[PDB]
Structure formats: C-alpha cells, structure tokens
Amino acid sequence: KWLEGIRKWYYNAAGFNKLGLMRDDTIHENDDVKEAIRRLPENLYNDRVFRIKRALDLSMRQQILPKEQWTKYEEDKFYLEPYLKEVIRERKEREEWTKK
Amino acid sequence: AAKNVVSQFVSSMSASADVLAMSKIEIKLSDIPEGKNMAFKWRGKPLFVRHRTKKEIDQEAAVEVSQLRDPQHDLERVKKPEWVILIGVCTHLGCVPI
Amino acid sequence: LTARLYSLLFRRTSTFALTIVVGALFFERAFDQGADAIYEHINEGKLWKHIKHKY
Amino acid sequence: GRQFGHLTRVRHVITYSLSPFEQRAFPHYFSKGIPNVLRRTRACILRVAPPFVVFYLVYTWGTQEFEKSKRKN
Amino acid sequence: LVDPLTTVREQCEQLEKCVKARERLELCDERVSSRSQTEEDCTEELFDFLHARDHCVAHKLFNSL
Amino acid sequence: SHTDIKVPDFSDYRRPEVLDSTKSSKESSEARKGFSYLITATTTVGVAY
Amino acid sequence: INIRKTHPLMKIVNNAFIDLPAPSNISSWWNFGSLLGICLILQILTGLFLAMHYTPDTTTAFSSVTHICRDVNYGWIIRYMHANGASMFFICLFMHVGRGLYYGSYTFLETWNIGVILLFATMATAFMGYVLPWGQMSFWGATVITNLLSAIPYIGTNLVEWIWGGFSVDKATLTRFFAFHFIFPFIIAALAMVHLLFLHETGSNNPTGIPSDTDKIPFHPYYTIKDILGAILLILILMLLVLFTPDLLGDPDNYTPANPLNTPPHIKPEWYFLFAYAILRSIPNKLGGVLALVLSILVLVIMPLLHTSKQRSMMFRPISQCMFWILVADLLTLTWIGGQPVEHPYIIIGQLASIMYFLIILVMMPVASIIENNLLKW
Amino acid sequence: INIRKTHPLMKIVNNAFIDLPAPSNISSWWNFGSLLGICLILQILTGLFLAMHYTPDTTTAFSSVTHICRDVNYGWIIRYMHANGASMFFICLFMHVGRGLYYGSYTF
Amino acid sequence: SDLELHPPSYPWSHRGLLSSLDHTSIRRGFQVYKQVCSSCHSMDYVAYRHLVGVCYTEDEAKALAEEVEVQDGPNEDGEMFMRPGKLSDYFPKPYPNPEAARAANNGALPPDLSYIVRARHGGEDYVFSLLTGYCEPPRVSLREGLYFNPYFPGQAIGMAPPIYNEVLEFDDGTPATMSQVAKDVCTFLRWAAEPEHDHRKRMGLKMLLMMGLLLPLVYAMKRHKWSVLKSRKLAYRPP
Ligand code: HEC
Ligand code: HEM
Numbered sequence A: 001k002w003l004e005g006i007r008k009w010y011y012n013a014a015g016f017n018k019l020g021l022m023r024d025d026t027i028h029e030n031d032d033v034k035e036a037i038r039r040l041p042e043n044l045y046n047d048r049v050f051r052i053k054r055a056l057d058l059s060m061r062q063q064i065l066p067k068e069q070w071t072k073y074e075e076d077k078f079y080l081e082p083y084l085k086e087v088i089r090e091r092k093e094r095e096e097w098t099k100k
Numbered sequence B: 001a002a003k004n005v006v007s008q009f010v011s012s013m014s015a016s017a018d019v020l021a022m023s024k025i026e027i028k029l030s031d032i033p034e035g036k037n038m039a040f041k042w043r044g045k046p047l048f049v050r051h052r053t054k055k056e057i058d059q060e061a062a063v064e065v066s067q068l069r070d071p072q073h074d075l076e077r078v079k080k081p082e083w084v085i086l087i088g089v090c091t092h093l094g095c096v097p098i
Numbered sequence C: 001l002t003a004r005l006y007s008l009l010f011r012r013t014s015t016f017a018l019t020i021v022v023g024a025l026f027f028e029r030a031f032d033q034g035a036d037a038i039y040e041h042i043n044e045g046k047l048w049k050h051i052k053h054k055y
Numbered sequence D: 001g002r003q004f005g006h007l008t009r010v011r012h013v014i015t016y017s018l019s020p021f022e023q024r025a026f027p028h029y030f031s032k033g034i035p036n037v038l039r040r041t042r043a044c045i046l047r048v049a050p051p052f053v054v055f056y057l058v059y060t061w062g063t064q065e066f067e068k069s070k071r072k073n
Numbered sequence E: 001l002v003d004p005l006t007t008v009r010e011q012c013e014q015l016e017k018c019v020k021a022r023e024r025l026e027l028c029d030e031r032v033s034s035r036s037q038t039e040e041d042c043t044e045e046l047f048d049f050l051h052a053r054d055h056c057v058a059h060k061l062f063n064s065l
Numbered sequence F: 001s002h003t004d005i006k007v008p009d010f011s012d013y014r015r016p017e018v019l020d021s022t023k024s025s026k027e028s029s030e031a032r033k034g035f036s037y038l039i040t041a042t043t044t045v046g047v048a049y
Numbered sequence G: 001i002n003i004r005k006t007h008p009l010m011k012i013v014n015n016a017f018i019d020l021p022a023p024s025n026i027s028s029w030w031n032f033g034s035l036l037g038i039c040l041i042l043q044i045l046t047g048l049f050l051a052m053h054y055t056p057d058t059t060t061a062f063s064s065v066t067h068i069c070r071d072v073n074y075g076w077i078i079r080y081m082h083a084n085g086a087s088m089f090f091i092c093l094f095m096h097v098g099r100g101l102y103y104g105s106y107t108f109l110e111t112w113n114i115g116v117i118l119l120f121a122t123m124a125t126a127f128m129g130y131v132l133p134w135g136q137m138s139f140w141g142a143t144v145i146t147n148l149l150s151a152i153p154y155i156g157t158n159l160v161e162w163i164w165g166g167f168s169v170d171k172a173t174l175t176r177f178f179a180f181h182f183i184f185p186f187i188i189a190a191l192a193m194v195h196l197l198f199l200h201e202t203g204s205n206n207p208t209g210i211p212s213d214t215d216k217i218p219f220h221p222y223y224t225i226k227d228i229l230g231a232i233l234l235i236l237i238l239m240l241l242v243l244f245t246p247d248l249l250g251d252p253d254n255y256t257p258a259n260p261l262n263t264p265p266h267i268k269p270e271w272y273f274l275f276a277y278a279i280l281r282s283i284p285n286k287l288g289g290v291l292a293l294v295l296s297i298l299v300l301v302i303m304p305l306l307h308t309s310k311q312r313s314m315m316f317r318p319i320s321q322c323m324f325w326i327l328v329a330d331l332l333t334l335t336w337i338g339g340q341p342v343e344h345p346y347i348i349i350g351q352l353a354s355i356m357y358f359l360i361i362l363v364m365m366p367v368a369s370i371i372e373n374n375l376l377k378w
Numbered sequence H: 001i002n003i004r005k006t007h008p009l010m011k012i013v014n015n016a017f018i019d020l021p022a023p024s025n026i027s028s029w030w031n032f033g034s035l036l037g038i039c040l041i042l043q044i045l046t047g048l049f050l051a052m053h054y055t056p057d058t059t060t061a062f063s064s065v066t067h068i069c070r071d072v073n074y075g076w077i078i079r080y081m082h083a084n085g086a087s088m089f090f091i092c093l094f095m096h097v098g099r100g101l102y103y104g105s106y107t108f
Numbered sequence I: 001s002d003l004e005l006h007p008p009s010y011p012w013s014h015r016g017l018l019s020s021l022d023h024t025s026i027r028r029g030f031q032v033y034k035q036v037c038s039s040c041h042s043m044d045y046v047a048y049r050h051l052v053g054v055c056y057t058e059d060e061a062k063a064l065a066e067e068v069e070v071q072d073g074p075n076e077d078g079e080m081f082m083r084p085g086k087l088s089d090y091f092p093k094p095y096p097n098p099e100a101a102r103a104a105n106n107g108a109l110p111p112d113l114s115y116i117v118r119a120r121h122g123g124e125d126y127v128f129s130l131l132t133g134y135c136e137p138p139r140v141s142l143r144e145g146l147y148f149n150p151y152f153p154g155q156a157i158g159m160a161p162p163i164y165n166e167v168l169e170f171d172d173g174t175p176a177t178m179s180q181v182a183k184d185v186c187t188f189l190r191w192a193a194e195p196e197h198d199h200r201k202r203m204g205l206k207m208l209l210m211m212g213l214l215l216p217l218v219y220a221m222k223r224h225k226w227s228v229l230k231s232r233k234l235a236y237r238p239p
C-alpha cells in the first residue's frame, strides 16, 4: 500500500529508532497525558523512565546507538493508548455532563 | 479630580507655545526655470510651486480626468493653468516626492 | 616543573590570586610590547614614526 | 518545576561517573567526532538547504529579469 | 602631459568588450542619427564600455602610482 | 544483587599516564592538578588583563 | 549551615542560578537568553556613557556625535559598541525566538506573552535609538513610522501631532524620543525579570520535547561556564564588527545632517526592520498595511493556539520541520527584498513572499502537523 | 484554589498588600513609608515630563527652563510639583528616619 | 537618468584587514585642500588643533593656524574683529548661510567634507573614481550651468574639475601630476571621515591576539568541566 510505505519511510526518517525510543515516549504533557502517565503499570513505568534517561544521556552526548539496537517497526509493545483513551472518555463524559 | 489631572497632563503633552505662532507667507514665482518645482518653508513644512513645461500639461489635459479615483478639473484647483501650486507632501504617510 | 608549580603557587587562595595578578602584569608588559612591535612592523613604510624620524 | 527532592519516583537505576582528572580533555577529536559531525551535517542539510537554493534561484532569476526589464534604454 | 589615468585608459581599451562595445555605441550613434527625435540617449552600451574599461583600469593602474 | 555490579571501563577516555593499574596514583596527582590549574590560571590571567 | 540558603537575597540568587534544576540536554541554542541579558546590560552601560556625552538638540545632535567620534578618548569605539551591540542584540533575539518556536517551547503561555511585550518594547526602543543620531535616514524613518501611527482614522492626526510637539518634526520631538529611549530598557530589564520568573515557575525544556525530571543538573558549574564561552564568542564577534568593518551593517546614508528639504532616493529603516517594512509596502493599502503589520505580530502571538499535534518539538517530525525551514528561507527572502529597492517586480515577489508567509504560519502549520499526527497511526 | 494564592505574581502581591500581617496599634508615623513611595513615583512622573521638555545645554538650559515655566502648557505646575515634591520627599524622609531611630527599629 | 553607475573598487594601501593609512598623504591632501579646494567646500568639524600630533608638531600647526586669519571674540568691545587664531579657531566658512553659498555657486551647495566619504554608497574608491574619471556630457543639452558626472545620480554637477595638472606643487621631488594629487586628497578625505583608522586596526590586532590566545583556554575549561557528563554511563537494576 502507498500510505503504509509512507508510514514505514516516515518512521525510518523520524529518527528515534536511532535513539532507542517507542510510541509511548514522544507525547506532549497536557493534564490528561500526565494523568494517563500516573495510570501506568509498574514495570512499564520503570522501563519508560529508563528509556527517557537513555535518550536524555544520548542526546546530551549526541551519539546514536548502532544498528543492532534500533527499535523496529512493528515489534512495538505500545501501551499508553488504552489508558489515554479511557482518560479522554472520562474527561469528555464529565465535560458533556456539564454541557447538558 | 484624577480625570482632571489626567486631562491636564494630556494638554501638557500637546505642543509648545511657538507652535501657535506660525502664519501666512507671500509667494512669488516669477523666477523658476520651466519644468521645475520650487520649495518654500511654510509652518515648518514645504510649499511647492512647479513651473510645468507645456508638454506635461498637454499630457495631463490630453489624458482623461474621470479615470482617477476622484476626478477634479484643473480650473477647480488653480487660476493659473500653466503654473501648478501644490502642497506636495504625500497623503499616505506625509512624504515629499521625487 | 609541574609539581613544583603546584607546590609553590597552588596551595592557598591568596597566593593563587597574587600569582595571577603578577602574571597579568607581566603579560601586560610583554603583550603590549609584542603587539605594538608586530603592528608597526607590518605597517613599515607609510607610518608616522618614519616622518617623526625625518622631522 | 521546583527545586530538588520531590521530582519523580525512580527506582532500578545505576549511574557510573568518573572524576575528570583521570580522563583526557579531547578523546579522539579528529577521528571519531569528525565522522559524528559529518553524519549530523549529512542528515539535515539536504532538508534545510533546498529552501535556500530556492532562495538563490529567486535571487538570480528575479535579479536578471529585473535588470532586463529596467535597462531597456 | 602623460597622465597615468589617461595612459592606462588608452592602453587598456585593447580588449574584446572594449572594442565591441565601442562599435555598439557607434551604431547607437548611427541609430540616434537615423531614428532621430528620440528619448533614448545611448545609455547601456556607453556605460558598459566605461564599466569594463574601469574594471581593467581597476586592476592595472596603481602599479607605479 | 550488589555483588553482581560490574563497573564498565573507560580506557577510551582516561589519560595515558594513568593507564597503569598497578602503580598507584599518589605520585602523578600533582602533575594533573598543576596541568589543569595552569590552564585555568592562564585563562584567568587573560580575562583579568 | 549556609548563608546562601538562608539569606533572603541569596535565597533568590540560589534558586535562580546556583541550585536551579536545569536540563542535561540543551545545546548552544539555549545560551541566547543569557546572551540577550549580557547584550542588554552592555547596551545599558554603553548607552549610559553615550548619554553622558550627548546634547539632544537638532543642531547639536550631529555635532555632538561628531564630538564623541573625534575628541573624547574611545568615544568612537563606545558609539560603535552601542550601535553594533544593538544589531547583534536583534540577531540573538531572533535566534531566541526561532529556538522557542522550532523546539515547541511556546506551549508556555505567560512566558510567551511577556516575551511579546519584550518584543514590542525593544523594537520601539531601538527605533527611537536609531532616531537619536538625527541623520537623514532617521528623520525620514521617524516621519514614516509616526504617520503609520497616524494611519488609524478619527484619532490619528491629533494623536500624532500630540506625540510630535507641533504640526511638524520639532526639537521637542527629538527630546521626547530621547526621553523614551532613555527610559525604556529599564522597563525591558524588569519585564525580562518577570519573564525569567514565570520561566522558573514552569521549568525549562529539552531539544526533544520529552520532560526531563530524571536528569536535572545544576546550572553551576556547567551552564555558567558554557554561558562564559558563548558570551566570549559574542564579545569577539561584536568587537570584530565594531573594529574591522563598523559599516558592514552600519548604513552609510545616516551620516548627513537632517536637511528638512533633502529627500534622498533610497529610504529604509535599519536592516533588522526590513520585514516589518516590506509587509507594509506589500499590500497597497494604508489601514490595510498597518493592519497587516499588526496581524503579522499578533498571529505570532496567536501561535500557541495553533499547536494541534501530540508532540512538543519538531526534532521528531521531519516534514513540518522542512516546512519550518521554508518559513526560515522566507524570512531571509523578506530580508533580501528589504535589502532591495522599492520597484515593481520586487513588490510582486514581495507580495508573493508575504502571502506565502501568512499561508505557512496561519494555515499550513496546524494542518501540516495534524497530517503528521494522522500519519503515525494515531 | 483562590486566584490570589496560585498565580506567581499574585503570590508576591499577596505577601505585599493583602496577606501581609501587621500590628494593630500603628500610629500615624508609619504612614511615611507609603508617603515616601508615593512621593517617589510622583517625582519620577514629573521628572519624565520634564525630560520630555528639557534641552541640557548651558546656553539653552536656562532658556529651556524659562520655556517650561512660561511657554509650555502647565509646565509651571509640573516643575513646581517636582521641586516642592522633592522638598516634601526629604521632609517625609526625615520623619521616617526619626521614627526608625525613635521606636528602636534600628535593632533591625 | 536615475540609473546609478557601478563604482569599481581600487586597490588601496589601506584597504585590507591590516593595511594602514598614509599620514604623509594626509599631510599632502591637507595642503592641497588648503591651497585650492577649500574655496567651495568646508570641513567645519575639524579645526587646526586636531593636527597637533597627526603629522606636524605644534610649530607648523601654528604656522598653518596663523597664516590663515579669521576672527577674534568680544575683547571688551563685542564687535568680532580679526585674529589669526592659535588653536581655538575652526576652519572658516567661505559662505556662512546656505543661500550665501547659493549666491556664488549656481544654487549648488557644496556639502561639507566631514562625512562625504562615509555618507555615500561606496567608500573612498567612489570619491577617487569621481574626481579622477571626468567626461563630457554626451546627449543632454541641459542648461550650460552644470557639468557632466559619471559616478553621480543625474550626472550634472556644478563643479569644474579640480584636477588641473601641475598647479599645486607639493613638497616632494615628483611633479604634482593629476592622479597623485587625486589619490592624496582622497586619502586625506578618508582621514577626514574616519578619525583613527590606524589606531582602530591597532586595537583590532591587539584584540585578535587576545582572542587568539583566549579561545583555546575557555573552550578547554568548558570541555574539561563538561567531560564529566560525557563519561557517565547508565546501568539498569530492576530485579
Ligand atoms: C568650487 C567651484 C569647488 C571646488 C574648488 C571644489 N568643489 Fe567639490 N563641489 C562643488 C559643488 C558646487 C558641489 C556640489 C554640486 C551641487 O550641489 O550642484 C561639489 C560637490 C563635491 C562632491 C560631492 C559630489 C556628490 O555629492 O556626489 C565631492 C566628493 C567633491 N565636491 C569633491 C571635491 C574635492 C575633493 C575638491 C578639491 C580637489 C573639490 N570638490 C573642490 C564645488 C567645488
Ligand atoms: C537605557 C540605556 C540606553 C541609553 C541611555 C541609550 C542611549 C542612547 C544614546 C544617547 C544614543 C545616541 C548615541 C549616538 O547617537 O551614536 C543611542 C543610540 C542607539 N541606541 Fe541606545 N540607549 C540605551 C539602550 C539601548 C538599547 C537597549 C538598545 C537596543 C538594543 C538601543 C539601541 C540604540 C540604537 C540602535 C542606537 C542608534 C545607534 C547608532 O548611533 O548608530 N539602545 N542610545
């Protein structure tokens, strides 16, 4: 598919498989993103702070980990999205309950 | 009392006293080489009288008048149709043209 | 050379301040003389000191 | 946001640090950092500079068209 | 008198652009003579001739000056 | 746990004078100290002038 | 224990500079806050000395700047310090703003608002400072900008002859501009302190957009010495600018007495003000021109509304990064058109450049970045 | 919570003007701090107006001062406000110092 | 016209990064301005007392200041009579009012030679090419009151060319030819525009030696105190 090849080319050109990151590490913090980060499992949260500390120390030293350590395209154990969707649903429920 | 004080400060920032001491001028234009614009000081600002060569006035009378954004005949601006008398400062931002 | 330098001038703070001020004055001396020398050496010819030498 | 003491609850982390007097100032400046900076240059300038070659084509093209239009005496 | 400006200006108009722009300005003179009563005073060829001549002056005048 | 901790090695970074593991560093200490402090002293002398 | 942690001034200095939790990630692009601070105190001090040796009157202005350039020891070097320090100040200011826009740091609100007020204050301040030499360019530029203030109807002519001091440019106008340039940078330093205060309220940023609470390193002794290195580089660039070519960025047409009947062919503000001068001459309208200028700056204020992505910084999003470099090239294009005279095909391509500028900043940034969000299977 | 107890400017203005504790037996002598503050901002305002109408040059300075006191609209009220405000500034200053030395506030 | 001609740059001896002026040429051009060229132009921001230590001593400074005789102040009479002028007098304006200069010249104000070099696009190469390259008016029978000028907008100056050959005889063994006196008076006008070009480059070279010695030092300390962060490395201890 054309757009799926665009997606693979775009994840190659995005440049955090170079940095050793994942889906759940690039998110901007609003209030609800922070709430979904507080709603996390223990092992995933500790892996998240270790990956954050690796990316910080690497981008300080401006070195990219080599080809044998890159996060591939569909091996990803994505995890923050169900918590995020639950928080969005609860927030929109509360706001629409105020709207009615 | 505070709005009196603010309005009196606004009046204090207005201008000076010699600003109210600027008045008329006599203008005589029997000296200009033809096609040239002469300048005169007037209230701290210029005052232009241009002697036009008659080819330019043949252009202006030959080209139409209603084409502009506001038409106005030359006799509705001057009694001397071969000597133009202007405040030659611009109306966008006040500039003297070349 | 190095351990003698740490022994003499790098034990207490006041001695370090004194030796950097004395180094600043000796650098003033040699740096001003070298800078003026090289500047007027690359501008030999049409510089004023030749005309003061004549006149 | 605030000062130290409260910021984030992190376990499971070891950091090894070295006193700088054991280590040299510039380890392999002209043999590893030069390929690093050449790679970092080589990544981005083919994305950043092609707007500037558009600028330079506008420079040359508009300049010559302007001189052709205004030098018809 | 031998003016070094005038000397380099005389010996420096030997170039391709100099001679060819000289004949271009002379044919512009022919054109203003033929297609007369005009508002075109032979600008570009004359100023480009003096422009290239002033370049060749600019390289090669302050030698013994 | 802590007995499994094995420290990485930094010979890509270290000084070549102290690439000698056996010979203790109570001797070449003032060399490194006077070297770096002479660099900082030259810096401060230039800035003060 | 400590005098630093207990004294009610050294508490402020400690929680500003000594024990500030700073990121372990920021490059030389984040030095420019301290670089603008040191440029600002340099402008304050050199302007103070230049104001000690100056008389503001319409005959004595050009004569007095001649006096400072000739008679008093090093008066010409401190004059050139203040001028080129203003120019390097504005270049470091636009590098600061480009950092804050490209690295997504404009998700802060009140920092951005106080920075906008700083931008207005420094632009009007340096404009009045450039009016102070009483040059021919400065006379006409004062006329241009003050009648742009008169461009709004029903208030304009009265308000502008009110901030003139008569029906024309007066000695009094020069005294007014001397007073306001003479008083504004202290207000600018106060607003910079409020800017820094809300910044220490929120916390700093990284290149990546990832919040970095795990690796807060102290400002001292790391960013102190890095700001020393960056400031020494700025000082050496500034001194080679004031010594080797003082008029590479000093425009030569300033150096004539302000003849009120002169009217030179070329007219421009000083070369930092070119894009604010091009958008005026782009769209042929008076109120439309000043309104387009106000719209340009206020849309640059509007920018945190436009952030629709799930990320923070453009380090990870390559296509909107390239779109931002198209914006950078269009900024440099507007600078080049500001460096070219007021003629017809250049006004054509300047309208093209200004409407493409607004097409990037208004519409293409959120739509482009939301296509970037949509493409990552989110 | 409250607007005043969260906003970082309003924290400082709250500690200055609203949540500032003060003793309840304050005499009239503790007015002179605010008197010196209001005299100071009034002096700065009048000085700014004088700075918009003054030409510091020894031949023209006295002529400019005369131009202020006669020619300028209300320049006489602004000049005399600056001078007499300076005088009352130092009067309130000596009252402030006399309070601070009288009531034992020099132990601060 | 209003098609401004390009000025071609010429190889000065003061053009480069470390190319200095010629104080002897400043003396030459000053004497040349004093002999003829002062008759229409003024240089009002430079008195004789600026030349105390430029190229003369005080002696020939007093010679140049007392040969020219201008004005005394109020000596308890208040009537402004004559004085040679030891050092206090400025250069005398030949025509005081603007209309006074417009009375002798056909209008045609000569602009004062303080900042003529620094006030135009193109530096002193522009002024040298202006004063050196004159030519006739080709095709514009203009007014028989103005003279043609190549490096000029409008190309009609009211100035007869002052490069008359061998009329000045400055003090060396070479004749006062055209190009020599033109270069000398333009070098003098570069000195009139910028006061301290050579001292500017002197401080430029001093601070080049400053920054050439200081940039290894401060960058060395910065690399020294940031290599601690370059050496710390991460390990991960969960169970
Ligand atoms: C009287 C005749 C002189 C003499 C002896 C010199 N100049 Fe020239 N000059 C004169 C006039 C009337 C004007 C202005 C033209 C006008 O207003 O119509 C000038 C102008 C210049 C300029 C400026 C040209 C420009 O503005 O582009 C220069 C650089 C200049 N004059 C130089 C110059 C020098 C170097 C002279 C001594 C050798 C000199 N002038 C003598 C009239 C006169
Ligand atoms: C409060 C401190 C300041 C004072 C007292 C001050 C005073 C002055 C004075 C007296 C001049 C005229 C000097 C001259 O004519 O050469 C001047 C020029 C100028 N000032 Fe300031 N100034 C100050 C701060 C600033 C700041 C912060 C800026 C902006 C960066 C600035 C920008 C300028 C500019 C652009 C000029 C014209 C430079 C030139 O002459 O070429 N000034 N200032």
Ligand code: HEM
Pocket: G030, G031, G032, G033, G034, G036, G037, G040, G093, G096, G097, G100, G103, G105, G106, G108, G111, G112, G113, G114, G115, G116, G118, G119, G122, G188, G192, G195, G196, G199, G203, G204, G205, G206
């Ligand atoms: C008046 C000139 C200015 C001064 C003196 C100034 C001062 C500072 C200082 C000292 C910092 C902290 C140092 C750092 O960057 O890490 C800073 C950061 C910042 N400034 Fe400014 N600033 C100025 C102009 C602006 C402007 C015009 C804006 C935009 C509206 C702005 C927005 C910011 C932002 C967003 C940051 C934080 C950047 C980040 O955390 O990544 N500043 N400024």
Ligand code: HEM
Pocket: H043, H044, H046, H047, H048, H050, H051, H054, H065, H068, H079, H082, H083, H085, H086, H087, H089, H090
């Ligand atoms: C920064 C703020 C200030 C500015 C800009 C300022 C400005 C001036 C100016 C321009 C003058 C001379 C004009 C005139 O006297 O008509 C002046 C005079 C004077 N100022 Fe200020 N001033 C300031 C603050 C102060 C302060 C704080 C005091 C003391 C409380 C003060 C006391 C005086 C006095 C005593 C005179 C002489 C008044 C006279 O002789 O008529 N000024 N000031």
Ligand code: FES
Pocket: B090, B091, B092, B093, B094, B095
């Ligand atoms: S057109 Fe803008 S001022 Fe005349």
